[PDB]
Paper text:
Viral occlusion bodies (OBs), also called polyhedra, are stable protein crystals that encapsulate newly assembled virions within virus-infected cells. The ToNV polyhedrin achieves the first requirement by forming a dense lattice, free from continuous channels, maintained in all directions by disulfide bonds, hydrophobic and electrostatic interactions, and domain swapping.
To generate experimental phases, the wild-type ToNV polyhedrin protein was cloned into an insect cell expression vector before three hydrophobic residues (F104/L105/L137) were mutated to methionine. The native sequence contains only an N-terminal methionine. The structure was determined using single wavelength anomalous diffraction (SAD) data measured using the nano/microfocus X-ray diffraction beamline VMXm at Diamond Light Source that employs a low-background, in-vacuum cryogenic sample environment. X-ray diffraction data for both recombinant selenomethionine derivatised and native polyhedra were measured from protein crystals mounted on cryoelectron microscopy grids. SAD data were collected from selenomethionine crystals, with dimensions between 1–5 microns using a beam size of 3 by 4 (H × V) µm.
Residue numbers in the entry:
A (entry chain A), B (entry chain A): 10 to 164, 178 to 235
Write the structure that this text describes.
């Protein structure tokens, strides 16, 4: 028995509400709901995207990578269209635009496709790192060389300059390993984000199952 | 148009089937399905548990940790009951027993509870590692000291022995950092497992939504 939970708008007009953005939790529209068969629920998945915009854009970047790895040529090549500006703005402008459209996407069908492509990219990257690290001598399969360079892209000895030649040979592996440490840190952050986001989506679907009955 | 996909048992009697365990894919029972409101689907989630038993037991261990961190005292303290043997067997025997019961669990309601507790444990561990690493000097919050020791548990200088005293002071941090590297590797593996498992569960729920209509 918790009237403050049944009546959240009335609760927000009290003296003991500590919410950071009162009343946002009852705003209803495409940006805060999902639907299956045009039955709507207020979506934990949409709330996550709003609370965690920074990580959501990291996952959108993975979607773009997934598209290229699935040969979705047109989707990939048009992914930065319709940005309007002829000048620089946010460094992540095309990703920010897609984030807005993802927030606007209500159908479970379309959101299933999004998470499926992101997970495909995450598994591809994990498989490439396992291959990198399975022997101290670095040897990658053909497909994993491609994944290595794709992730790397979509994301001197002043005392005796002649000695830099030897330094470069020694350092080639340090640079590759540094790339993999960076990719590994990005993957852990993307995985913790994905785990939480898809659990929120899973809980939203239970809510839909309850309501569709 | 793919008759071999509509008629998988007939396909398994052909000359071009490469499946590793033909006919397993049409076995129907509690161990291969889930249900909502007693509407059943053949479950990707159950197939994952069967293909990935090793990782499933890692996630079950996280459930047990989650229980202790949520104060579920009775569930925790009884979690190794009913093992029958008075001798040693599989090193993971109580976890193996629980794995069998998880595979036997059909209701979406109960499986939601499982994943929710596991995710709680994963987030707790990630938060503890972020705290460990946020300064080179190691300082953990009170709650994170507890999480550090819980995860660590649930999972000499022969030339001049006197010098070991100094060695131990130097090595205390190396041991703690080694623990965190080990925990970090376990977390990445648990996260990649969880990502795939809960996506399979999410896809199963879409299948249920389609069928419940
Ligand atoms: Ca290799
Ligand atoms: Ca700290």
């Amino acid at each position: 028995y918790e009237p403050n939970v049944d009546y959240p708008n009335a609760s927000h007009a009290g003296l003991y509400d500590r919410s950071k953005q009162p009343y946002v939790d009852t705003a209803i529209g495409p940006k805060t709901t999902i639907q299956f068969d045009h039955v709507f629920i207020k979506s934990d998945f949409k709330t996550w995207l709003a609370h965690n915009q920074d990580e959501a854009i990291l996952l959108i970047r993975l979607y773009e990578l997934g598209l290229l790895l699935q040969g979705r040529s047109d989707s990939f090549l048009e992914f930065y269209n319709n940005t309007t500006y002829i000048t620089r703005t946010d460094s992540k402008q095309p990703m920010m635009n897609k984030y807005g459209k993802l927030v606007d996407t209500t159908s479970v069908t379309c959101l299933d496709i999004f998470l499926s492509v992101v997970l495909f990219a995450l598994n591809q990257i994990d498989s490439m790192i396992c291959d990198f690290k399975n022997t101290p001598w670095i040897n990658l399969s053909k497909e994993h060389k491609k994944i290595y360079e794709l992730v790397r892209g979509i994301f001197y000895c002043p005392f005796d300059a002649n000695s830099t030649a030897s330094a470069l040979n020694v350092n080639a592996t340090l640079n590759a390993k540094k790339t993999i440490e960076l990719i590994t840190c990005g993957l852990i952050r993307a995985l913790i984000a994905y785990a939480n986001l898809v659990t929120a989506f899973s809980a939203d679907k239970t809510a839909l199952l309850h309501e569709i009955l």
